[PDB]
Structure 1
Amino acid sequence: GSLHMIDYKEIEVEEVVGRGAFGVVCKAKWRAKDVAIKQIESESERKAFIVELRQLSRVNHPNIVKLYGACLNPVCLVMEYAEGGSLYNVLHGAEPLPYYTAAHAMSWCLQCSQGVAYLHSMQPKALIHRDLKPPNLLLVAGGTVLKICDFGTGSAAWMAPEVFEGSNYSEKCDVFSWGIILWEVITRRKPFDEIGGPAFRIMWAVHNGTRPPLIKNLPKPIESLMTRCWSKDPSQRPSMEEIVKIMTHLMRYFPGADEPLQYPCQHSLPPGEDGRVEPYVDFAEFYRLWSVDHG
């Protein structure tokens, strides 16, 4: 629980790259280092911004964004620069989009659950992220390593129904989100894109039972996990610790996650029947590797 202190005058700020729950994130330089910083856009944000430092001073984990230091001259946080930027951008952003594999898809989710599991295990009190979604998931090391940010804080497509119903919630809201992200990286589709209108239309939908469509040829181990994560009832969702364990196990069947994203991709988006959709990733190699171990 300590924060390295930075003089703001020794930072050279550059173009905007993000905006989280509050503040604004920019590309910047600091001691000849490529860097991200978030600032307060308004003096009114001073208080929330201080709480986030008190949490981030305590966290420390490979799948959470490295906070280099901070400053109070004007109040600001200095982080590592995710060259890849947002997972949202990688999946859905401007062209050219990178090619990625099932192995990448699962490795990303594994890494996210590892990050959240750490948060959930925090003492004296668990940190709940509350806003898990690809815009908050940053990539480094050539698309290989995923890192969480904007935690302890257009979100409706990843929000557990008990949250937006204003009711009591817990760690399990993050598990719902994670279930949605899993679907998203396997399909490379925006959840509830075809619903649209404002967020309340998605909230009504999800509240009333609606989930993303099922995925043609999805392995059942993964399908059962994903859909347990989506349960209306939070107590029916697995814990993140369990998701980590499961996902660690499945990675046996997904080699190649260490390969950097380097191939462009011009995939079209072929709409399924309306009931089921096709995955973007290919599970053929999973089914083959699985056969060698089992039947």
Structure 2
Amino acid sequence: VYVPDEWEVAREKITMSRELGQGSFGMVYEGVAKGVVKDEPETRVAIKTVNEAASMRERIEFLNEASVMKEFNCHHVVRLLGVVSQGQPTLVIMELMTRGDLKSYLRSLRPEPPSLSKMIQMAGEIADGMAYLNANKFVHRDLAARNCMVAEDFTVKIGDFGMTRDIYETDYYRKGGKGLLPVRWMSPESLKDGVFTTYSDVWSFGVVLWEIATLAEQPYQGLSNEQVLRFVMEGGLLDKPDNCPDMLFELMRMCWQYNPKMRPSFLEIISSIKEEM
């Protein structure tokens, strides 16, 4: 069960354009929306949707994951703008991040070195969103560059585009043939016991920093999914990226302490980069 509220907006006011990709519950689109932002008759939006052919309790699961965003007010987490629970298909409308996911954005820079400054900006802008989420008692459990989102001004925001895009099929393993797992981005304790925490979010952040420093290479390129498990669970780590600044590899290491209680908080990460400006 879900009860509509003041977030509800009318299907009429929402246009869909070109598709953005396959979501957990449906296709996702680019669009425009009216009367959803103050002094702004039109607003470009991401329209997340459901397949008419999905369960009623999956249309309920879909809405109650958007109900979590109603609580948030951080400029580094992608903004919930409205809901359309009434009728078919069921929609959520969000802030449109006009440069898409951090992984495509970094990959688009290969054939052209980004400055320590810019890499440390991006790093602080990810760590701000995550600090907020961790404090509003939210564990991302799929923090990766492909789940960060980039604004027209190049500011980075935490988002989540699910585990279902064709484009990043390499980044997921159906372990034991169960559900998809982003094994390359997972803490040793997430891999062994299925323990997701703030602290395992800090591990995924270490791998995002690696992704920024490598321009989104595949972590542990040349190991199989089962070989990644073995390597990380026995205390293995990623190598210093080529041309990696000292300050940014030391962040990485901190985030990859085997003992979760040894990794720093996002709050401590922000403090740590702040004494570097």
What is the TM-score of this pair, normalised by structure 1? 0.74
Distance 1:30 1:37, change over 3 A: same
SS of the equivalent of 1:68 reads strand
Residue 67 of structure 2 is aligned to residue 67 of structure 1: no
**Match of residue 58 from structure 1:** 71
Contact map agreement 1:13 1:29 (CA 8 A) in 2: yes
Give the structure 2 partner of residue 274 of structure 1. none
* 1:1-295 equivalences in 2 (<5 Å): 4-31=7-34, 32-41=42-51, 42-44=53-55, 45-73=58-86, 74-93=89-108, 100-122=114-136, 126-143=137-154, 145-150=155-160, 154=172, 155-192=182-219, 194-195=221-222, 197=224, 199-215=225-241, 218-250=244-276, 252=277
The Cα shift of 1:177 comes to 0.5
Moved more, 70-79 or 28-37: 28-37
CA RMSD, 1 decimal: 2.6
Deviation of 1:224 after TM superposition, in Å, equals 2.5
Q: TM-score, normalised by structure 2?
A: 0.78
Q: Return the letter of the residue paired with 1:133.
A: A
User: What is the alpha-carbon distance in structure 2 between the residues aligned to residue 51 and residue 60 of structure 1?
Assistant: 17
Counterpart in 2 of 1:280? Answer: none
| Partner deviation per Cα, 1:110-165 (whole Å, 9 max, x = no partner) | 0111111011112xxx111111011111001332x111112999222212121132
Structure 1 residues 201 and 96, CA gap change in structure 2 (3 angstroms): closer
User: Following the alignment from structure 2 to structure 1, what is the Cα–Cα distance between the partners of residues 162 and 17?
Assistant: 27
Query: Does the aligned pair in 1 maintain the 2:139–2:196 contact within 8 Å?
Result: no
Structure 1 residues 232 and 106, CA, compared in 2 at 3 Å: closer, same or farther? same
Read off the aligned partner of 1:231 and give its amino acid letter.
Q
What amino acid sits opposite 2:60 in the alignment?
K
Provide the C-alpha distance between the structure 1 equivalents of 2:250 and 2:80, rounded to a whole number of angstroms.
Answer: 36
- Corresponding residue SS for 1:78: strand
> How far is 1:189 from its partner?
4.0
AA matched with 1:27: E
Aligned residues: 244
For 1:86 and 1:245, the matched residues in 2 are separated by 26
Cα distance in structure 2, aligned partners of 1:192 and 1:171: 21
Higher relative contact order (CA 8 A, sep 6+): 1
Residue 97 (structure 1) shift: 6.2
Deviations 1:155-181 (A, max 9, x none): 222121211323433210110000111
Deviation of 1:85 (Å): 0.6
Q: CA deviation at 1:195?
A: 2.4
- In the alignment, the residues of structure 2 paired with residue 14 and residue 207 of structure 1 have an alpha-carbon distance, to the nearest angstrom, of 44
Identity of aligned residues (%): 27
